[PDB]
Design a protein around this ligand. Structure first.
Ligand SMILES: *CC(=O)Nc1ccc(NC(=O)C*)cc1
Ligand SMILES: [Cl-]
Length: 86
């Protein structure tokens, strides 16, 4: 029950999947992020652990063109840089 407040771009991403609160648990942020990736089918249909996020809000957010869902350290860093732990 780490509570977080997302930065503007991450809030836009969360609201695009129906999450309109301003404060979240980290678990909620990760959940919505995964729902965003799935709905927009940003993962590679043949290599489904690879997310291509160039030219998308998620890439603008993360500042990378792609990442593997298995890269937890990198993903947590990119998420942390886009919110404030309160
Ligand atoms: C179904 C599936 O792929 N589950 C899964 C569980 C855990 C992890 N990684 C870690 O817990 C670090 C990957 C995939
Ligand atoms: Cl932002």
């Amino acid at each position: 029950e780490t509570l977080v407040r997302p930065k503007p771009l991450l809030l836009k991403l969360l609201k695009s999947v129906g999450a309109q609160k301003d404060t979240y648990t980290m678990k909620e942020v990760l959940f919505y992020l995964g729902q965003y990736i799935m709905t927009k089918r940003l993962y590679d249909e043949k290599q489904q652990h690879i997310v291509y996020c160039s030219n998308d809000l998620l890439g603008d957010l993360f500042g990378v063109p792609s990442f593997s869902v298995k890269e937890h350290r990198k993903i947590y860093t990119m998420i942390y840089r886009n919110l404030v732990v309160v």
